[PDB]
Amino acid sequence: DIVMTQSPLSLPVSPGEPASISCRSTQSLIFGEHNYLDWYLQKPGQSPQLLIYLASNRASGVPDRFSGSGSGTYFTLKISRVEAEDFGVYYCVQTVQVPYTFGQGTKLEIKRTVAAPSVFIFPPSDEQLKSGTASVVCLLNNFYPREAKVQWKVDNALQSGNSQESVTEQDSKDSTYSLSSTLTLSKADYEKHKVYACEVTHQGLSSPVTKSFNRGE
Amino acid sequence: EVQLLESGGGLEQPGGSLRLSCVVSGFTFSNYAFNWVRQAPGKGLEWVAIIYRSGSRMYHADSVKGRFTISRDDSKNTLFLQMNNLRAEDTAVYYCTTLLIYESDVGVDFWGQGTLVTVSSASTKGPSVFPLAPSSKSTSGGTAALGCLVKDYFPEPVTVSWNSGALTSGVHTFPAVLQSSGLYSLSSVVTVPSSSLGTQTYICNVNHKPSNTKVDKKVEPK
Amino acid sequence: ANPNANP
After folding, report:
1. Based on the domain organization, do B114 and B149 belong to the same domain?
2. Residues B127 and B221 placed together within one structural domain of the fold
3. Where residue B126 sits, what CATH number does that domain have?
């Protein structure tokens, strides 16, 4: 197949500043006198919307902030001055050869200032322990940028494979992210250890922050 | 007004079958090729199949070849996708779309709203709600947070409000994660000032319409 | 190529 590589994968841009998204193919997209690459924008909960067709032609109704360029295997979408409504995920797709393939998508984010997360630790509830399972949750509240490292330690033992993370979309008010990490253990495995800690590393923090607890206070 | 209206989605077990339909109105259906494009939850767009206006030329993607079949009934201006031998990874929103139409030197493109197909072996299950309570020391620093762990439900979605939907400031409801059990799990937290703690009471309202279940779990510290 | 993008 043809592999479409988009760069970057995440693009934080302040409103009014320009943005540039590239799309790479592993095979030339030329047929005749056209390059068969289109640019789409998909907002959350909406259908994709055509922005640029055939590499460099602006679709009807698209504002002049949008332009496309490139030929062969390298193509670029540019926004001269981003506005609030251009936030979303941009996809390129080639149609010169079947199977048609999409890029991974480029998430255009809101570039706000750096914000440190507020960290909270939640032990498993007594109700859940009556089912056989223990869930420890670690909350990172209202931070920026998205890049953050969460590590679980049970009696100073780094965990691996038994945790899952989930991050919200950028908040529509303050443009921050929030992240939850859930450590899932059996009731028996939970009661075998005493100290549970999640360690957070983030740009807004000078040094990593650790919030912990002990079973039964 | 052009409209592409999809239907035929819903829940089915692995190995089962669904047949998606896309009825095109206000548009000369017979003259154009049509595509199916799907998008797994949170993932990206993936091209599935194409059928040309001729009807004799049609292509399918490798991932779905031999299991899905694209077809068209020009007499009813309707596009179809027959989905057999369904797999868990076929769970996605499916869009019918013409993709780019370039003629008379102008470019247009029409998409449907999408229809969700969920492929899973799990039985419907309402969620269990467990409180996530702060430590009473974590509440001294002005603001305090608390939330609800929504565990072991199927299918999507659940909806979570706070105090029956009155409280909306500082609430973050996280995207569900499909556990290895085939059941979803999420948490919903809300930061509130430790002062109104004793004065009032915060409850999370979990609603899972597929199971006709509604749960209100009061959340408090210590 | 794309049939709706008349080659």
Report:
1. no
2. yes
3. 2.60.40.10
CB contact under 8 A, A104 and B149: no
Cβ atoms of A154 and A196 within 8 Å: the answer is yes
Q: Which of B94, B106, B109 to mutate against chain A (most A CBs within 10 Å)?
A: B109
Domains delineated in chain A = 1-111 (2.60.40.10), 112-217 (2.60.40.10)
**CA of A97: which chain C residue's CA is closest?**
C1
Structure determination technique employed: X-ray
Distance CA A158, CA B163 (A): 37
Write the CA distances from B91 to A56, A157, B178, integer angstroms: 34, 37, 12
Q: B114 and B164 share a domain?
A: no
Question: Do both B41 and B147 map to the same domain?
Answer: no
Which candidate in C2, C4, C6 is best for mutational testing of the B interface (most B CBs within 10 A)? C4
Q: Kindly provide the residue ranges of all beta strands, DSSP E only, lying in A19-161, ordered along the sequence.
A: 19-25, 30-31, 34-35, 37-42, 49-53, 57-58, 66-71, 74-79, 88-94, 101-102, 106-110, 118-122, 133-143, 148-154
By the CB < 8 Å criterion, does B184 face chain A?
Answer: no
Q: Which domain holds residue B170?
A: 122-222
Distance from CA of B100 to the nearest CA of A (A): 7
Residues in a beta bridge with A109: A12
Sign of CA dihedral A28, A32, A34, A36: negative
Quick check: B102 and B41 in contact, CB under 8 A? no
**Domain finish residue from B96, B121, B146:** B121
How many angstroms is the resolution? 3.2
Inter-residue contact B192 to B200 (CB < 8 Å): no
Q: How far apart are CA A50 and CA C7, in angstroms?
A: 19
> Which C residues, 1 through 7, put their C-beta within 8 Å of a C-beta on chain B?
2-6
B19 & B129 share domain: no
A96: nearest CA partner in chain C: C1
